[PDB]
């Protein structure tokens, strides 16, 4: 049962909330580096929720950094209740049972998050421009793949676009009870919703490549 104490330990998630080189198929999704940098300048830690549900908060956004190709953020899933649900549910996922690739070690909880919420979705105004980052099955903004991992550093190095300078900025930030007022049922219901998102896998692949995570080893099930 000691195998569960580390299984329910914090999990980091990283990815781009927006890609400047991607034209939104909807104006409301436009978000150029200029706005981002002013906003980042204008404004505790933004909450991390499940599919934008304000009751399914699982952690916080540890770092936000505008970089060459977009706004990249790094979050931390810290809800014991949530991490616990994910643990129980991972034991029952065939996908999780197929384990990870190359020489990675199976991490049921991580692999599970990787699969359910392969996308990141920023919530901001059309002061506090940035409201919250959301974990989801796919973001309406392209290139928003969610990379989960037990180590911040490790997670950040899964993205080829980032440079040592970038990592310093993010590292500096991330280095500086229980907000999950939902349950397994709420999660179950939300998943059925995801099965009907049109072109879920296609965009998820498009995202994996565009962000160059295709080129590395990670727990991305996408």
């Amino acid at each position: 049962d000691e195998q569960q104490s580390q299984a329910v330990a914090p999990v980091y998630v990283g990815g781009f909330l927006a890609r400047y080189d991607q034209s939104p198929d909807e104006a409301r999704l436009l978000l150029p580096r200029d706005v981002v940098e002013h906003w980042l300048h204008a404004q505790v830690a933004l909450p991390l929720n499940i599919n934008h549900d304000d009751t399914a908060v699982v952690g916080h956004v540890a770092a936000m950094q505008s970089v060459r190709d977009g706004l990249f953020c790094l979050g931390c899933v810290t809800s014991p209740r949530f991490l616990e649900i994910v643990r129980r549910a991972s034991e029952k996922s065939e996908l999780v049972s197929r384990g990870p690739v190359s020489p990675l070690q199976p991490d049921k909880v991580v692999e599970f998050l990787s699969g359910s919420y392969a996308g990141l979705s920023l919530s901001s105004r059309r002061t506090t421009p940035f409201k919250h980052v959301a974990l989801c099955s796919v973001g309406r903004r392209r290139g928003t793949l969610a990379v989960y991992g037990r180590d911040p550093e490790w997670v950040t190095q899964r993205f080829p676009d980032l440079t040592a300078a970038d990592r310093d900025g993010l590292r500096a930030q991330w280095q500086r009870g229980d907000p999950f007022r939902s349950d397994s049922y709420g999660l179950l219901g939300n998943s059925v919703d995801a099965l009907y998102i049109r072109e879920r896998l296609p965009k998820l692949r498009y995202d994996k490549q565009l962000v160059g995570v295709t080129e590395r080893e990670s727990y991305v099930k996408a």
């Binding site: 909330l17 934008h52 979705s121 919530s123 901001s124 309406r140 903004r141 928003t144």
Partner: peptide
């Protein structure tokens, strides 16, 4: 607000 807009959510992605």
């Amino acid at each position: 607000v807009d959510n992605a």
